[PDB]
């Protein structure tokens, strides 16, 4: 309703960098809010793309941002009669960013890895990797849970079981309130998908530079499966956390698997041991149900609700025809130990190929009426096809079926405005939570400030 679409703030990265592909709010040790921005095609030291991360101080005028520097150099270690190798070319550093406490986690899902031993090798594969920074201290760490030193032949002899070579760890990421990093790795276990978790504190204390393969003993990974429903399911394409079992000392994980069961798609809610508590099945094959997931209590009963995006959902129209528009599903959490039901609300796109539901950001309570609200991105939506973000307000029965506000892209065609979204943080300290919108195709991010309701 009350985001200001007249006086925006723009931050800009280098041309071709995809600045804005990912973003998050970051609070420093003093509560000063900054914006962390991923730019996964930023050029590295060999004038080759490796990605980068920027940490933008809050200014109404916006502008250029300083880099948050990470080591962009390929590493080699000869040890244990093996040769360990990292390859950061085209790794996509900043394809996901997330902030927690005074720490920033920025991931490079396409970082490649190999191990040589005489004439054999592990195979050069995209294990992915995450880089962790504490900006104020300069501390740096890394976490790459899918690196191994097993040779190609042993996977073949063991029927490709527990094959983490194509994980793409960091493809999606989230940090629990207690500070456990949870990474989605949609290529894990030969394209089934996996989740990897470890406390941030243990990531920092276990890392040393140059080691490349090290143990983070408090870590926990999900499991391989023999069930074809999971094959090529990309479980971990999106991740979120929330409270869904009524027990406030356990944190539950929400995981999107948008090609689960022969492209039907699914989202699963699990406990922290990766045991499945609920599964939401997609409605339409190829809709990419699970592309995005969001967790927020929208109806003011103190129980977290789930939103799921299916950006390629085709809506039925006159004369037995179908129109790709995208859809968002709201599932309200019932009282007590019961199943999440059918959806409580379906929100459906209008613009053909608009990809409504491609991103869903909790906004907190934007209009200050006691119900949390959401923003849904349609990156190619709007009457001009340039991208739209739509705000829907919470209410006692769930969400309103009609947007309170629509933000049309201020950028040119092709910007992908809305592909990344983040809300629920008051960046200017005016007592209303604000919205940051990435437009990676324009290498920019737009800040919408919430203002008093008119």
């Amino acid at each position, epitope marked *: 309703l009350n985001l200001d679409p007249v006086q925006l703030t723009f931050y800009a990265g280098p041309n071709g960098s995809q600045f804005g592909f990912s973003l998050d709010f970051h609070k420093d040790s003093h509560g000063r809010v900054a914006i962390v921005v991923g730019a996964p095609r930023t050029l590295g030291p060999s004038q080759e793309e490796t990605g980068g991360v920027f940490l933008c101080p809050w200014r109404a005028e916006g502008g250029q941002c300083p880099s948050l520097l990470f080591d962009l150099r390929d590493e080699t*270690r*000869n*040890v*244990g*009669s093996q040769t360990l190798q990292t390859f950061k070319a085209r790794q996509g550093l900043g394809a996901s960013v997330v902030s927690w406490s005074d720490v920033i986690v920025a991931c490079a899902p396409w970082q490649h890895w190999n191990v040589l031993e005489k004439t054999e090798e592990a195979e050069k594969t995209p294990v992915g990797s995450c880089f962790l920074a504490q900006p104020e201290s300069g501390r740096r760490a890394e976490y790459s849970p899918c690196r191994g*030193n097993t040779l190609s032949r*042993i996977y073949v002899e*063991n029927d490709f079981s527990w094959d983490k070579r194509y994980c793409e760890a960091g493809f999606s990421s989230v940090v629990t309130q207690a500070g456990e990093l949870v990474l989605g790795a949609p290529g894990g276990y030969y394209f089934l998908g996996l989740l990897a978790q470890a406390p941030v504190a243990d990531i920092f204390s*276990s*890392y*040393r530079p*140059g*080691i490349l*393969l*090290w*143990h983070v*003993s408090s870590q926990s990974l999900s499991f391989d499966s023999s069930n074809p429903e999971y094959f090529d399911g990309y479980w971990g394409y999106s991740v979120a956390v929330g409270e869904f079992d009524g027990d406030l000392n356990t944190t539950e994980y929400v995981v999107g698997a948008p090609t689960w069961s022969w492209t039907l798609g699914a989202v699963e809610i699990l406990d922290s041991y990766y045991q499945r508590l609920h599964r939401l099945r997609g409605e339409q094959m190829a809709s990419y149900f699970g592309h995005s997931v969001a967790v927020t209590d929208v109806n003011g009963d103190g129980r977290h609700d789930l939103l799921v995006g299916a950006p390629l959902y085709m809506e039925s129209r006159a004369d037995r025809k179908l129109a790709e528009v995208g859809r968002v599903y709201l599932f309200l959490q019932p009282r007590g130990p019961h199943a999440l039901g059918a959806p409580s609300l379906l929100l459906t796109g209008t613009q053909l190929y608009g990809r409504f539901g491609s991103a869903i950001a909790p906004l907190g309570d934007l209009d200050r009426d006691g119900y949390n609200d959401i923003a849904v991105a349609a990156p190619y939506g709007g009457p001009s096809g340039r991208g739209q973000v739509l705000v829907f307000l919470g209410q006692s029965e769930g969400l309103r079926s009609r947007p309170s506000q629509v933000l049309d892209s201020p950028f040119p065609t092709g910007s992908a405005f809305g592909f990344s979204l983040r809300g629920a943080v008051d960046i200017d300290d005016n007592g209303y939570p604000d919205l940051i919108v990435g437009a990676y195709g324009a290498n920019q991010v737009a800040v919408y400030r919430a203002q008093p309701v008119v």
Partner: antibody, heavy 119, light 108 residues
Framework: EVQLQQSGAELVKPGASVKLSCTAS????????VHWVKQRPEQGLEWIGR????????KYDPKFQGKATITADTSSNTAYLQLSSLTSEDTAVYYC????????????WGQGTSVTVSS | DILMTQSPSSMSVSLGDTVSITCHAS??????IGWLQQKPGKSFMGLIY???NLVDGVPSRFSGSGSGADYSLTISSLDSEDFADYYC?????????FGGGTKLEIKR
């Protein structure tokens, strides 16, 4: 707290075999490589081999090919060293070892099992 | 196999001293070296891994340095508990090989 707890002193006849154990405490033995190391006062420290208890794959110094067999049972959280066709020169203290962080290192050691081979 | 020549085999030093123990490998091992301590009649504790990294719990009076084939363990200001045996180990290559050790004894 990580501790490797080895079996007690063994006292066996020459030509026999003995199976030393090393039980992980405060962790899953599956987490890292487990190594076995031989100490004598004269010859000093010698690496026997290692095992990855997750999958059972082993590596040995070729000097111990035939003598040393390293196995593991993740069910009992334990790694073993079997020495066959025992001799006076097999009389030593035997240690199981695992790394702290580095996959390839040798940082945590069990308390040692004493073996004496005599008639 | 990589030979690890550790020196000196023993030294008679005193409390407060700064003493260095060196280890020379028969070829470069790119800091894939660990240092170990064996107190009289007790088992081993790891001190250093990968050349220069302190094992958790080890006091900072211990430092490791070196590169290529030549490495050092330095102990600054010896405590009574530091009089013990020390061994290097390399893990650049299988089989892992150890130095012949260094016993710190009390001078008088």
């Amino acid at each position: 707290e990580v501790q490797l707890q080895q079996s007690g002193a063994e006292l066996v006849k020459p030509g026999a075999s003995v199976k030393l154990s090393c039980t992980a405490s405060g962790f899953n033995i599956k987490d890292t490589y487990v190594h076995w190391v031989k100490q004598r006062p004269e010859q000093g420290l010698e690496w026997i081999g290692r095992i990855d208890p997750a999958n059972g794959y082993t590596k040995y110094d070729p000097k111990f090919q035939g003598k040393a067999t390293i196995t593991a049972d993740t069910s009992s959280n334990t790694a073993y060293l079997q020495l066959s066709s025992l001799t006076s020169e097999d009389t030593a203290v035997y240690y199981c070892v695992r790394p702290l962080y580095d996959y390839y290192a040798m940082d945590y050691w069990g308390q040692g099992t004493s073996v004496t081979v005599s008639s | 196999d990589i030979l690890m020549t550790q020196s000196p085999s023993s030294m008679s030093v005193s409390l407060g001293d700064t003493v260095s123990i060196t280890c020379h490998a028969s070829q470069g091992i790119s800091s894939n070296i660990g240092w170990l301590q064996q107190k009289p009649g007790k088992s081993f504790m790891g001190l250093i891994y990968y050349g220069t990294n302190l094992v958790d719990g080890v006091p900072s009076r211990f430092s490791g340095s070196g590169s290529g084939a030549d490495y050092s363990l330095t102990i600054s200001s010896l405590d009574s508990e530091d009089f013990a045996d020390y061994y290097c180990v390399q893990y650049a290559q299988l089989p892992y090989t150890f130095g012949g050790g260094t016993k710190l004894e009390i001078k008088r």
